[PDB]
Amino acid sequence: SSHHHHHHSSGLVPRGSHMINAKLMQLVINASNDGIVVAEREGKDKPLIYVNPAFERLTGYTLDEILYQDCRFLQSGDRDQPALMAIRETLESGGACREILRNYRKDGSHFWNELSLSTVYNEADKQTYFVGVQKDVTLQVKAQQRVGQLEAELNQVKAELAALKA
Amino acid sequence: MINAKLMQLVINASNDGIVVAEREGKDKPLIYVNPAFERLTGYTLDEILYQDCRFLQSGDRDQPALMAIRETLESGGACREILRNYRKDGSHFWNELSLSTVYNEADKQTYFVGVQKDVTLQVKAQQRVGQLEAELNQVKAELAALKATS
Numbered sequence: 001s002s003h004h005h006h007h008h009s010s011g012l013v014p015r016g017s018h019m020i021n022a023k024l025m026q027l028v029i030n031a032s033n034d035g036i037v038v039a040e041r042e043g044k045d046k047p048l049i050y051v052n053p054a055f056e057r058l059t060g061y062t063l064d065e066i067l068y069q070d071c072r073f074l075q076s077g078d079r080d081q082p083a084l085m086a087i088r089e090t091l092e093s094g095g096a097c098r099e100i101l102r103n104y105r106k107d108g109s110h111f112w113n114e115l116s117l118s119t120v121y122n123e124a125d126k127q128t129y130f131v132g133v134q135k136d137v138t139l140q141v142k143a144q145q146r147v148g149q150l151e152a153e154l155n156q157v158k159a160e161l162a163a164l165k166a
Numbered sequence: 167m168i169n170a171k172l173m174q175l176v177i178n179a180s181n182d183g184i185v186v187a188e189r190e191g192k193d194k195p196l197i198y199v200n201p202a203f204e205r206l207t208g209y210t211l212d213e214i215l216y217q218d219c220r221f222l223q224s225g226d227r228d229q230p231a232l233m234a235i236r237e238t239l240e241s242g243g244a245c246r247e248i249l250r251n252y253r254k255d256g257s258h259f260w261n262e263l264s265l266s267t268v269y270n271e272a273d274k275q276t277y278f279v280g281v282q283k284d285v286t287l288q289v290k291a292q293q294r295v296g297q298l299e300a301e302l303n304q305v306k307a308e309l310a311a312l313k314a315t316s
């Protein structure tokens with residue numbers, strides 16, 4: 001049994017249009033606990049055109065150091081990171097991904113950054129934009145690193161035990 | 167930096183489930199969710215909107231993150247907490263809630279913004295660390311006893 005309302009639902013009107021009229025989305029995204037950023041295309045680069053204060057606190061870098069350049073500067077030259085190829089493929093082909101990179105704050109310290117990215121085509125101006133949600137996942141990556149070394153060491157002991165038996 | 171029309175487009179299209187709530191007495195009803203949140207929970211926009219997001223607990227209420235969420239939001243802070251949630255089809259997942267509070271001077275209302283993601287594989291992968299360390303000790307001791315017999 002059910003009591004559903006029998007209305008048609010349209011996709012012609014952008015979802016959450018009341019948030020536009022009340023400027024509510026700008027307010028709450030500026031307040032988010034996660035780093036949130038928006039980029040546009042410019043040749044071989046994807047310069048940032050929006051970042052929120054959580055992203056500045058995350059990176060320690062200032063807004064003018066961040067805005068209007070490609071996010072790759074956070075790699076601080078650590079350009080030999082494997083996740084980069086997966087990120088390029090998503091952003092060039094369209095779609096969504098969640099990928100972890102090493103990044104460096106303004107004060108030199110490092111951290112594990114998890115990039116949750118997607119592309120969105122804008123019918124108005126015919127441009128593709130990109131949106132990213134970022135956060136420090138250092139503790140979670142260290143745990144995953146711990147499982148991997150624990151299994152490599154479990155197999156050494158197991159194999160040495162199996163050999164001494166046989 | 168960007169206008170509100172573009173902001174709405176990109177938040178609507180985010181990879182992450184993003185919701186906005188408003189203060190309404192003892193509740194914080196949801197006033198916006200994006201399609202990624204519909205995909206994460208299996209509920210539709212009409213099923214989700216205007217109720218408090220606690221329905222995703224399906225009455226699973228002895229969860230320690232609940233006290234932390236309440237204390238944070240009631241004092242206007244931000245938090246990152248994990249709890250058991252249930253999709254529309256009843257399947258369980260660990261949901262990580264990244265929440266923050268903001269007062270709107272224009273309308274004198276308090277709003278909340280949340281980002282949600284599935285961390286089931288990560289919580290279950292973390293639980294392996296302790297299990298592996300205990301098994302590694304057990305096989306090492308079997309080798310130490312066998313090598314003494316040689």
Ligand SMILES: Cc1cc2nc3c(=O)[nH]c(=O)nc-3n(C[C@H](O)[C@H](O)[C@H](O)COP(=O)(O)O)c2cc1C
Binds near residue numbers: 039044070113117
């Ligand atoms: C929306 C968006 C956010 C991004 N955020 C980060 C980030 O926080 N840290 C990082 O190292 N790279 C980030 N990137 C990736 C770089 O901007 C760049 O795309 C990446 O380094 C691969 O591009 P490239 O190899 O051509 O330089 C982001 C990319 C996009 C589109």
Ligand SMILES: Cc1cc2nc3c(=O)[nH]c(=O)nc-3n(C[C@H](O)[C@H](O)[C@H](O)COP(=O)(O)O)c2cc1C
Binds near residue numbers: 239
């Ligand atoms: C913006 C926002 C998003 C939330 N998202 C979730 C969620 O995805 N899952 C969940 O179990 N609770 C979520 N909650 C928590 C509940 O709405 C509620 O605050 C929580 O259960 C503790 O309050 P209560 O004791 O009144 O239930 C969210 C809360 C806010 C403010």
Ligand code: NA
Binds near residue numbers: 264
């Ligand atoms: Na989250």
